[PDB]
Amino acid sequence: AEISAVLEEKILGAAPKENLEETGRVLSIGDGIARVYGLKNIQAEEMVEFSSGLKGMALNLEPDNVGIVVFGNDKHIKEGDIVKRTGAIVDVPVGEELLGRVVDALGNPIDGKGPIGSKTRQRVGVKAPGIIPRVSVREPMQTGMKAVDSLVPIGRGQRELIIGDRQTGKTAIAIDAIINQKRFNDAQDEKKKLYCVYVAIGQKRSTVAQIVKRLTDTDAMRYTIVVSATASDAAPLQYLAPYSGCAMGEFFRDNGKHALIIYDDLSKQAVAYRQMSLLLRRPPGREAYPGDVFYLHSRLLERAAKMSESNGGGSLTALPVIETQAGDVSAYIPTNVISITDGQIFLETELFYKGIRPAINVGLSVSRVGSAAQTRAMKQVAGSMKLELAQYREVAAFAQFGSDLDASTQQLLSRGVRLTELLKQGQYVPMAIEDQVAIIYCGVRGHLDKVEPSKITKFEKEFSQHIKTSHRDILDTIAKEGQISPDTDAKLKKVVTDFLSTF
Amino acid sequence: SNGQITAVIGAVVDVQFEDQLPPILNALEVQGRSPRLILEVAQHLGENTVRTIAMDGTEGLVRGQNVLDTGAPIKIPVGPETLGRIMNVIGEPIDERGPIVTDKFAAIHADAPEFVEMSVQQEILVTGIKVVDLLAPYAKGGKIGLFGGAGVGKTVLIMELINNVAKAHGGYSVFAGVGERTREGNDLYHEMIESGVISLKDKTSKVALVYGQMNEPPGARARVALTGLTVAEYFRDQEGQDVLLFIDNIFRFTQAGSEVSALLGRIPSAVGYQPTLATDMGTMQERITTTKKGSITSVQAIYVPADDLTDPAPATTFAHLDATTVLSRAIAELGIYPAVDPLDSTSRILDPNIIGEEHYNIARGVQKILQDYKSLQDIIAILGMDELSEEDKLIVSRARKIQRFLSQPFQVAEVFTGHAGKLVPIKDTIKGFKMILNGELDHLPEVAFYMVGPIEEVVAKAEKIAESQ
Amino acid sequence: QLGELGTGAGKGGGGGGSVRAAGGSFGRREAAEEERYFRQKE
């Protein structure tokens, strides 16, 4: 602390007034970093307020100055401006008043729909739940996609990474998961309701506006909170936005309800955090990232948990998004998030342009919850599907130069081709779990071997309609039983053969 | 003495003392703090200022806050009172079962046992895993490393080793959860309770758990491995027991040291790491050893970043282990579980004079067929299977039978797959692979060798396939 | 999308020789001819 005014008043023995323990003055300001002299009673990661009305967070506490990141444009901050302590660390509004609202990283509404009447505020940096308060992940979290709910299942309380290149369908997976919860939120079952939270980090405001337009048209906005820290916002806002959205989802998790968080995308939050660390003169590491960039994502995603029945039983499900560069998952940030999350959904550009949409690489996509994240009917049909897809994987290569094949092998090749075309699905149309089970069950029991793969989608709509208004007793029978009995299997096969004769 | 906080930058806190300075590795406690934040002295900066790393979150720290020197390093409770309990990095009970009432405390920093105290006993530890027992057999009292990337099966393998060894071991066991998922720690804690290894009523608990997970700061994740090691060292030394030390994951000890090393004023090393990587790993690993007083059988899961075994953290760990089992993604993608690479996993007791001549010759014979299989695959790609001659036909056919037979269903993975778990004696493993090498089962299909424990189940599965088809 | 055999070691499907580790289409050719022979045998 040796500046010319402070040095000179130390020579005179003036003992100056305006004591700098709850206040301070800016020494240097630039690139969103303000070095402030004073603020002696300040706390680490504490909010401050500048004389221009802007807010800031004190990250570096040093004997001479305080390193403060600026929540906005630093053109308003000037050298010698008065910085005041807020007195508390960063907190955001929480509650159900934020459902249907678009907010920034600090909780201020940006959709122009008026003030938010929230009653409670939680600090964004709470500690994750421990070993005791959480229970094993057991409830299915329905994405609505056949390739996800069967092969890479997601349970309530699980971090599942959606990783891929640019324009591979990562946002498509996340938005369709939010849209799929319309069925459960309309129903009377309070246990199966899911309140989604979408966090947009570093995107365009027109991209976020297109997201809100899609969610409002599908009426998914009533249970969705959109936290938006776009590219025009400051790097501290984009860094703070996943923790703000996590705190909003932690309100539902701690109150017995089930919430879903999408961080779209965490690769941009690392870029924002790298910019703050470099401009705070902290020494960089791999790809100029700070050392604590792993702890950045680990302390965020660990707060996604399935609480025990003594803590209300609520869950917090996280779907982080990571963008790779030409499929390089050996980079610093994709490697960290893969090692943190409970599973991955790899999306490949080669599969995307081969017609496979969603472009999920089944050989690279894992899920550490396994069959416990699936319902009983889905577990019965996805296990048989995983065996048949494994058998198809052994025999799918024969189309390269093979010409004569065994009759059983040809049946395996034909059924697996039907299954690969079964896993394809259009965008913005998530299907219910009963429809996914029924279509997959027909695919793995040979009910589609006589159908050309080009008409699989037409069969998927029309046959499901036929067993909906006419054979709804069978659907009630499966729902009450919870699985597929041999008698129900024979009944469904007879309806399939009757429908194929009429087809 | 008493000090005051000078700087707070990340997980690194600089504190200044007026009286005599605390030594390096001493434990400092922040006074105006509710969850008992503890700082560990890392270096003396001069001008009566020491630089520390925090064992908990640093939010809300104020420059000028009083810090108290405990006069000693981090001391944790040790003894039988830690059995069936969960401890954090600083020894506080995090299982919500009240305080750990005990009379014995041990510092988590200690010198490694000397060269005079080293034991050269090497006897094979039978695990029931066919690829482990045959190709890279574990030794009692030796160090075991489970190398692998993300999702290859290190956690499932270390859960299977706990099920097969620690349930009927005889003597205490210690699990150290270092920088992993809290869900996995909750899953293991309830699996131990259901298995009876943890008793919530009686004093018959066998395993002591120490957990510092991904949500912990880098200071806690870089010292929680020393906390679990201190519990294992007390059981080895002050009780003479045989100790099982399961660590998952030991890479997080290295990674958490690299996160704070930039803020400690260090130039980065190659790839990007602390310059003290080999020394910090060496001081930690050489405490985990079999003394002449007692034996510690250590099984450590080792994360391989981006499946690059030439990364400095897995590469330095190789020299510290008697047996290394490398889990490969290529093996796992074929459906083979466990995904142990047969041509990348080594053991020190893989000797004719330790495991016998028949065990050694079959293991070397298996590795020779699998190596010739990799060499022949390029000819198969170009020339095709039509032009290979009957010798290479039998090499490829027996290699696929061997490669399928290395897979095995795990009891801890039964909920994942549905296959019942199977435990295979070492004698049945040697006999089973000898039959495939001799060519006694050349008429069997290769699907009969997939996910079956003994070779008698291979014959039964082949008969079932033939009868059904 | 299933990680076809011979597409690459660690790339979804593969494991074996240099061609199978490299993946692409020659690893697919190696897996195709090998699996065709052993399916003919069974």
Binding site: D328 | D378, I382, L383 | G17, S18, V19, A21, A22, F26
Partner: peptide, 26 residues
């Protein structure tokens, strides 16, 4: 990456050796 190119270069080198050997025989 560097490892991917090294693996691919090793495979193509083995392909050339086999085809050169096949060319001499044929």
């Amino acid at each position: 990456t560097l490892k991917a190119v090294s693996i691919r270069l090793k495979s193509v080198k083995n392909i050339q050796k086999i085809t050169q050997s096949m060319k001499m025989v044929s």
